[PDB]
Ligand binder design. Structure first.
Ligand code: ZGS
Ligand code: LMT
Ligand code: LMT
Ligand code: LMT
Ligand code: LMT
Ligand code: LMT
Ligand code: LMT
Ligand code: LMT
Ligand code: LMT
Ligand code: LMT
Ligand code: LMT
Ligand code: LMT
Ligand code: LMT
Lengths: 203, 460, 201
């Protein structure tokens, strides 16, 4: 079947150059235009398209920023991205039906144009001296540059909010609606050797 | 008590809807399916091949069923025509209708194209067999066949003109792709196709009424008829005859090349010559040139010999087919080559019919027992031409799909235009060369033996 | 570049019917593709030429003739609650709109304010966190440190699988030097005809 396998996530630094690949398989790559997309937490943009046995056609916004290449001896469709800073997005590699103009099969690879690599800081945000029935506890994770996995010890009432940029690092919050409070701890899931778990005290 | 001129005119007029519908389909169905119906060219290739092969399949089966039809109070052929025409015009109108379905438009077009081909066969095969029932005298039958041929040519011209000038008048927006990167609607084009189909169906019903009213049956009561179920034996006997088989192969190939041109010429005009709004005028020019060139070729076959006539008529389109793919689509060169291709179409579809009675006389001299060879030849020829023209059209549209033909488009890729130039310039020239080489091996040698065979026709 | 526009970026539908509308700035001649993207997955083609499915469940039909296109789901299930896009394949520079479905629930927000912890106060910082765990619709959060503040960072999750309600986290980051402006109040404004104020001193 037609499929396009894309490279893993890349982390360029400010103004580096990033080359994304699609190992297209299941179809003659030289017969179809292989496209690229661009989704930065929004709707889908359109960088360019590349005919693997010929011309490359760009959008006027991406002329000089994107550069599409096609290796027909490896059935590989590649996108080289130049100057960066706001190109942190997800790039797709959808091929095209030779007649219509729509995209039947797609890919997907993330690009994160940021700088730094830091260990997260865990703060046990708690109540301010009040209580009525069920009470809300929390946990603030501040100052990291990867994807964490916040967990709680066997309690399923948690809401882990999506992270946001604060300068060049990421901030995340978690909340739990616990009725009784004998003992609760916040455990984070930062894969880069930072597995700090901290309890939540009173006041 | 002979055939009246009004009766022969009605019989001839009854043969016009077949030519009108056939020329409209064979010139515009690829344009309708690929562009107007918004079909994948794989599905369009499937539909074209299956419809033009089901026509060939339905010809002998409906022929046998008509041969088994008994005698009613209205005739042997009139009930078939009268009960087939409303369903035929319904299916013809539903060929050129684009339904609103989520998936399976290919099934719609397959079903209605094949149903229309079946009902048109049920119209035509009794109608073709009707020339033996209108009158007993052979001269009246020949006069009726001459009337039918003249009105068939006029019906070809009228159907091409009607479909071209109704379809082409209302244009539609194109579709730009990445090969183009650096008010009329599509529904108006679909409405134009429906209007043309409705006008053709009205002409179909009017001519069916004319044919039913103006033509009688005389009963005949099989006065000299015979079962003649020796279809396979007759085919084997005809193929065992040298000149017959050679004429079959030559005419078949030549007609295959020109049916390939008839199929994939509108796409060539639109996407290579750039006539997005003027291809219908080019088709009308070709048809008018063929109509004008019929007396020219009837003059040339007599004044210069049928052999040289059928050679130069087939080889005349070759320089112009070379020219139309080696020039940057000049407006005057296309019209000149259209006139030349009309002259060559007239030659190709006229001169073998002139050569046929000589081969009939030769077969009569060779085999004293002859009971259908003139009809067995036409049945074999029409079956193979319809089936192989469907095969060629399916392969052509599938190759357009392989080359990446864009639906509508305003410009095709450099590989689709190459396939169109091959399908207009390479494959028709190859088939014409094959037919010419077969016609070279012609032991009849025009008149050099023909009158001698006629002398044996005087002897027996 | 034809301007493809989906007006409603959020749609409410539970099990009855959804009619996602796409409008083009130029007449595309019935050339509109419809994609369905689930979160964490690439966009998957549903409809092409504005009416033709591509191997998908029969509930997702689509209509439209010229500069007004609609996709209709008549049996909207849990897999159908994803994001949808309408692409035009009339001209070379292809363009998308963007839309999403949501289930329907009641109303009623909640709020809770949390002061900075001692550990954050030790390392030269103070983040006041306002949590808004369960509500349906859209909400606005205002910070009053005896005066309105516009230096807060806000985040929202999607919709809960079971509760079918949204949440919100507002973080106000203030250094220790600027940590003497009196009392901190978080004010929430939802469809409840009154703000919810949670304050600390
Ligand atoms: C507007 C331009 C139209 C067309 C393009 C080029 C055209 C050539 C036009 C030619 C004149 C005749 C066309 C060829 C004949 C028409 C088809 C045909 O040929 O079908 C009828 C009949 O000719 C069948 O032949 P059949 O052997 O069955 O008749 C035997 C009868 N009889 C036993 C009494 C002697
Ligand atoms: C049976 C009667 C019907 C007649 C049928 C005649 C149809 C003939 C088909 C024409 C083939 C077109 O020829 C085509 O040209 C291009 C450009 O050189 C070449 O094709 C090239 O591009 C395609 C991409 O589409 C790739 O597979 C590859 O890079 C290469 O093969 C081949 O040569 C051939 O694919
Ligand atoms: C009578 C002749 C012989 C019988 C037919 C033999 C072949 C029948 C084919 C069965 C399947 C038909 O469908 C076949 O599958 C592929 C699947 O990618 C389709 O491929 C295409 O389908 C549609 C067509 O626009 C596109 O939206 C889609 O993006 C693309 O994948 C082709 O339309 C066709 O080649
Ligand atoms: C689409 C092409 C046809 C366009 C219309 C052509 C005009 C129609 C006339 C075609 C036949 C002409 O041929 C001639 O017609 C007339 C009228 O029917 C016949 O005349 C016959 O019918 C008329 C009544 O209508 C009687 O008055 C007359 O006594 C009788 O002989 C002739 O016997 C016939 O020789
Ligand atoms: C749908 C596309 C096909 C359209 C054409 C299909 C139907 C037309 C084929 C001709 C069939 C005519 O229908 C015919 O009617 C007469 C009744 O009067 C019957 O025919 C019979 O009539 C009488 C007995 O009744 C006898 O002379 C004899 O047995 C037979 O001729 C049969 O019922 C049928 O042979
Ligand atoms: C003389 C010739 C003219 C005489 C009059 C002819 C009028 C013909 C006009 C076209 C009317 C048919 O229009 C067409 O009908 C069928 C059946 O309802 C519809 O088909 C629809 O219904 C069928 C029901 O099984 C389903 O496959 C599906 O819901 C859909 O395909 C088409 O979407 C519609 O476009
Ligand atoms: C002679 C050789 C024949 C070879 C044929 C090879 C190609 C055949 C095309 C295969 C796909 C077409 O098959 C098509 O399937 C869909 C359902 O899936 C049917 O479509 C039906 O259901 C869909 C919704 O699911 C709606 O459009 C509508 O209710 C109805 O049209 C069509 O009625 C059928 O025609
Ligand atoms: C729109 C522009 C075109 C308008 C055409 C209007 C045509 C009106 C009727 C005129 C028919 C001309 O008729 C012309 O003469 C010869 C006979 O000499 C006919 O020839 C006919 O009879 C001879 C034998 O008798 C055979 O070749 C054959 O049966 C048949 O072709 C042709 O059918 C035609 O070439
Ligand atoms: C509705 C769709 C379009 C329908 C168009 C109908 C137009 C009808 C045109 C008339 C065609 C008949 O034209 C006629 O053909 C035959 C042979 O071809 C020739 O005429 C032949 O039969 C007549 C019969 O009386 C003899 O007088 C004449 O001696 C003989 O040569 C002439 O060429 C022409 O008189
Ligand atoms: C494009 C459609 C053309 C329709 C033109 C109108 C039809 C004209 C009829 C011409 C038929 C020629 O055929 C002639 O008919 C008359 C009838 O009176 C006969 O008398 C002649 O012997 C015959 O040669
Ligand atoms: C007898 C010869 C002289 C006749 C001269 C009269 C010219 C018209 C011939 C009748 C043909 C009628 O053909 C008819 O055209 C109209 C529009 O073009 C079509 O009408 C269509 O238009 C709308 C456009 O929004 C479509 O949405 C809808 O599918 C349909 O109603 C009919 O489906 C078709 O049946
Ligand atoms: C031998 C007999 C020859 C008879 C030839 C008769 C054909 C008449 C040619 C008509 C020209 C074709 O062009 C077509 O005309 C009709 C009449 O306005 C238009 O159709 C119209 O009717 C439909 C009805 O719903 C409306 O959408 C709208 O009023 C308009 O589109 C088509 O949009 C146009 O494409
Ligand atoms: C509603 C629109 C559809 C109709 C359009 C207008 C139709 C024009 C053609 C009218 C029918 C012509 O055919 C009509 O039938 C009778 C026979 O039944 C024919 O009559 C002719 O054939 C037979 C033969 O023996 C005899 O009756 C007679 O010797 C002869 O004149 C006439 O040629 C004509 O009067």
């Amino acid at each position: 079947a037609s499929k396009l396998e894309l490279s893993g996530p890349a982390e360029p630094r400010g103004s580096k150059s990033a080359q994304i690949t699609c190992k297209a398989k299941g179809f003659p790559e030289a017969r179809f235009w292989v496209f690229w997309l661009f989704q930065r937490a929004a709707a889908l943009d359109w960088p360019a398209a590349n005919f693997s046995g010929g011309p490359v056609q760009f959008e006027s916004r991406f002329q000089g920023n994107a550069s599409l290449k096609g290796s027909q001896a490896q059935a590989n469709a590649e996108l080289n991205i130049g100057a960066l800073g706001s190109s942190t997005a997800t790039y797709r590699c959808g091929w095209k039906l030779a007649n219509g103009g729509f995209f039947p099969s797609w890919g997907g690879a993330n690009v994160n144009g940021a700088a730094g690599a830091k260990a997260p800081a865990v703060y046990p945000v708690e109540i301010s001296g009040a209580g009525t029935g069920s009470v809300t506890l929390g946990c603030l994770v501040k100052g990291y540059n990867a994807k964490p996995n916040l967990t709680w010890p066997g309690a399923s009432g948690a809401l882990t909010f999506p992270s946001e940029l604060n300068g060049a690092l990421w901030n995340l919050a978690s909340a739990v609606t616990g009725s009784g409070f004998p003992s609760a701890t916040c455990a984070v899931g930062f894969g880069a050797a930072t597995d700090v778990d901290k309890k939540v005290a009173a006041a | 008590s002979r055939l009246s001129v009004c009766s022969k005119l009605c019989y001839a007029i009854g043969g016009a809807p077949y030519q009108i519908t056939g020329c409209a389909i064979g010139f515009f169905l690829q344009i309708y399916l690929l562009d107007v119906a918004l079909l994948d060219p794989f599905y369009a290739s499937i539909i074209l091949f299956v419809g033009r092969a089901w026509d060939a399949v339905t010809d002998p089966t409906v022929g046998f069923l008509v041969s088994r039809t008994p005698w009613t109070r209205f005739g042997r052929m009139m009930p078939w025509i009268v009960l087939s025409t409303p369903f035929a015009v319904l299916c013809y109108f539903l060929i050129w209708y684009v339904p609103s379905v989520d998936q399976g438009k290919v099934v719609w077009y397959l079903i209605f194209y094949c149903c229309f081909q079946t009902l048109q066969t049920c119209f035509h095969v009794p109608y073709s067999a009707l020339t033996m029932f209108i009158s007993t005298e052979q001269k009246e039958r020949d006069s009726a066949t001459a009337y039918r041929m003249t009105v068939e040519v006029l019906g070809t011209l009228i159907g091409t003109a009607i479909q071209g000038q109704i379809v082409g008048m209302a244009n539609a927006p194109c579709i730009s792709t990445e090969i183009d990167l650096q008010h009329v609607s599509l529904q108006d084009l679909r409405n134009a196709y429906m209007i043309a189909s409705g006008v053709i169906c009205a002409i179909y019903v009017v001519c069916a009424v004319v044919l039913f009213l103006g033509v009688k049956e005389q009963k005949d009561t099989c006065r000299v008829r015979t079962e003649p179920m020796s279809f396979f034996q007759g085919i084997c006997m005809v193929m065992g005859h040298g000149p017959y088989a050679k004429l079959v192969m030559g005419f078949l190939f030549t007609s295959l090349a020109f049916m390939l041109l008839e199929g994939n010429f509108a796409l060539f005009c639109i996407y290579n010559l750039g006539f997005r709004n003027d291809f219908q005028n080019v088709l009308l020019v070709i048809m008018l040139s063929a109509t004008l060139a019929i007396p020219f070729w009837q003059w040339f076959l007599t004044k210069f010999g049928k052999k040289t006539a059928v050679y130069i008529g087939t080889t005349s389109v070759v320089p112009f087919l070379i020219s139309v793919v080696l020039v940057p689509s000049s407006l005057a060169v296309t019209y000149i080559a259209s006139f030349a291709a009309g002259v060559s179409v007239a030659a190709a579809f006229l001169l073998p019919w002139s050569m046929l009675p000589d081969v009939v006389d030769d077969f009569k001299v060779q085999n004293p027992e002859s009971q259908g060879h003139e009809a067995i030849f036409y049945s074999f020829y029409v079956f193979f031409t319809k089936f192989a023209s469907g095969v060629s059209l399916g392969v052509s549209t599938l190759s357009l799909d392989f080359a990446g033909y864009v639906t509508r488009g305003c410009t095709q890729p450099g590989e689709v235009k190459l396939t169109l130039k091959i399908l207009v310039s390479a494959a028709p020239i190859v088939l014409i060369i094959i037919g010419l080489l077969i016609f070279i091996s012609y032991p009849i040698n025009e008149e050099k033996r023909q009158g001698n065979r006629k002398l044996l026709n005087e002897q027996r | 570049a034809l301007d493809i526009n989906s007006p409603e970026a959020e749609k409410n539908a539970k099990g009855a019917r959804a009619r996602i509308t796409c409008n083009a700035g130029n007449q595309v001649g019935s050339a509109v593709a419809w994609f369905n993207q689930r979160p964490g997955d690439p966009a998957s083609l549903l409809t092409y030429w504005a009416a033709t499915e591509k191997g998908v469940a029969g509930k997702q039909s689509a209509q439209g003739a010229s500069t007004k296109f609609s996709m209709s789901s008549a049996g909207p299930e849990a897999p159908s609650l994803s994001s949808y896009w309408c692409l035009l394949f009339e001209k070379g520079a292809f363009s998308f709109g963007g839309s999403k479905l949501n289930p329907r629930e009641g109303a009623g927000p909640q709020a809770s304010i949390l002061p900075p912890s001692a550990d954050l106060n030790t390392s030269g910082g103070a983040a006041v966190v306002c949590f808004l765990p369960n509500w349906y619709g859209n909400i606005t959060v205002q910070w009053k440190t005896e005066a309105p503040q516009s230096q807060a960072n806000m985040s929202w999750p999607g919709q809960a699988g079971a509760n079918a309600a949204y949440a919100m986290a507002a973080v106000l980051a203030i250094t220790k030097g600027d940590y003497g402006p009196g009392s901190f109040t978080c004010n929430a404004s939802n469809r409840g005809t009154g703000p919810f104020a949670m304050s600390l001193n």
